[PDB]
Design a protein around this nucleic acid. Structure first.
Ligand SMILES: [Ca+2]
Ligand SMILES: [Mg+2]
Ligand SMILES: [Mg+2]
Length: 430
DNA sequence: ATTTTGACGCT
DNA sequence: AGCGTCAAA
């Protein structure tokens, strides 16, 4: 009752660029705008592997992970943009730089946590308090929320999408108590106003469109973000949680899309997030561990406390290349040449990072996969990273992995290598 | 033969 | 330290 926390203490947004790599290429090449198009890596094997897909192409059934040749079977007029190749490998520099454009715009509004190349969490609690102070009890106009959906509305006693959006928004604003500066629903509504402003700023200053979720924590903000894409934002209030979760597959909640979610479904014999409410905290801890159990018990009630971390920059800088099937590296020379290619890209990115961000990586992580291993990585070794020098880094990586070569022949490498990975970690201020 | 990434938990 | 999990374009 009066002491039961409700996880309504924060306003958190998650902003996620729509079909990000596609928008980067469409900004660059106007011929691709408003077309079924996709971004692809490589080209020789089955036309290349698709990594990003415009919504026009998605209407034909084109998806990520599809080979371009097969996507062309579904969408004959599909246009393609190729990822840059440098030093024999795909190079994602263009997308990292576009990401920096968006992250720097978002950081003007609030502290952000970079969650991936194209998405960031925003802690809007403080910004909401100031905006509420400026508003001075003034009602919030639907005009301030031109692209916002209120999850769960309209409800109760138009057949077009925008009509429904406005109906729900009208119901929500009609119900709001604007005189209580401490109302969680009001705080979320002001948050959504700020996110409308953030998203307009991103589109104005970059050309890129995005979607966003606004809620009281990161998990609900992420889930909300996905409910109305593209180019829209969704507010998930605390009160919307019971109905939303009553038919929400467990796997749709962030961190439950893999084995743990599968085990929750299998062990408990449930399908939807809301069904978790029927278990005690101790029961959930008994099956999934103390930490997971406490997290699940609160999350199924819409409560999560993971903070928006103040971190705009990635914590590691890595380069990697797979060598599938017959291309697996089977000679020492091959392994050293590709280690050099990776190390040269890594050096270029590390030097840029050091100049821009006043930091230096101090550890080099070397990871390989050997042909015949189910795991993504077969082996991981670290060494000191003391100089931004590609030849030294590639030599050091070879030194830490050379004993993995079973082969009795000095010139040959066995078992052949199907993956190489170099990652600079453990940054210190400089 | 999705590939190339990036964060964080466990022991 | 090294491995595993979950997630992104
Ligand atoms: Ca996205
Ligand atoms: Mg996606
Ligand atoms: Mg994303």
């Amino acid at each position: 009752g009066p002491h039961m926390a409700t996880g309504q203490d924060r306003v958190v947004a998650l902003v996620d660029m729509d079909c990000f790599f596609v928008q980067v290429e469409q900004r660059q090449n106007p011929h691709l705008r408003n077309k079924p198009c996709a971004v692809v890596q490589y080209k020789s094997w089955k036309g290349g592997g698709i990594i990003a897909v415009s919504y026009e192409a998605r209407a034909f059934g084109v998806t990520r992970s599809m080979w371009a040749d097969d996507a062309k079977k579904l969408c004959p007029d599909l246009l393609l943009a190729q990822v840059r190749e440098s030093r024999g490998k795909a190079n994602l520099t263009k997308y990292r730089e576009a990401s920096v454009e968006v992250m720097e715009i978002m950081s003007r509004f609030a502290v952000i946590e970079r969650a991936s190349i194209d998405e960031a969490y925003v802690d809007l609690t403080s910004a909401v308090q100031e905006r509420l102070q400026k508003l001075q009890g003034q009602p919030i106009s639907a005009d301030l929320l031109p692209s916002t959906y209120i999850e769960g509305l309209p409800q109760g006693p138009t057949v077009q999408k925008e009509g429904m959006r406005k109906q729900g928004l009208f119901q929500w604003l009609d119900s709001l108590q604007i005189d209580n500066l401490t109302s969680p629903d009001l705080q979320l509504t002001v948050g959504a106003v700020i996110v409308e402003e953030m998203r307009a700023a991103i589109e104005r200053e970059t050309g890129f469109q995005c979607s966003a979720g606004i809620s009281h924590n990161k998990v609900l903000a992420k889930l909300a973000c996905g409910l109305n894409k593209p180019n829209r934002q969704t507010l998930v209030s605390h009160g919307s949680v019971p109905q939303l979760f009553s038919q929400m597959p467990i796997r749709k909640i962030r961190s439950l899309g893999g084995k743990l979610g599968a085990s929750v479904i299998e062990i408990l014999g449930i399908e939807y997030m809301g069904e978790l409410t029927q278990f005690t905290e101790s029961q959930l801890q008994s099956h999934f561990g103390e930490k997971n159990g406490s997290w699940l018990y609160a999350m199924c009630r819409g409560i999560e406390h993971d903070p928006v971390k103040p971190r705009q920059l990635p914590k590691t800088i890595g380069c990697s290349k797979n060598f599938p099937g017959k291309t697996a590296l089977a000679t020492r020379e091959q392994v050293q040449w590709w280690l050099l290619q990776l190390a040269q890209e890594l050096e270029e990115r590390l030097t840029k990072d050091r100049n821009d961000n006043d930091r230096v990586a101090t550890q080099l992580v070397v990871s390989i996969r050997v042909q015949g291993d189910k795991r993504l990585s077969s082996l991981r070794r670290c060494c000191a990273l003391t100089r931004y020098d590609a030849h030294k880094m590639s030599h050091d990586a070879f030194t830490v992995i050379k004993n993995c070569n079973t082969s009795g022949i000095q010139t040959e490498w066995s078992p052949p290598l199907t993956m190489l990975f170099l990652c600079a970690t453990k940054f210190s201020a400089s």
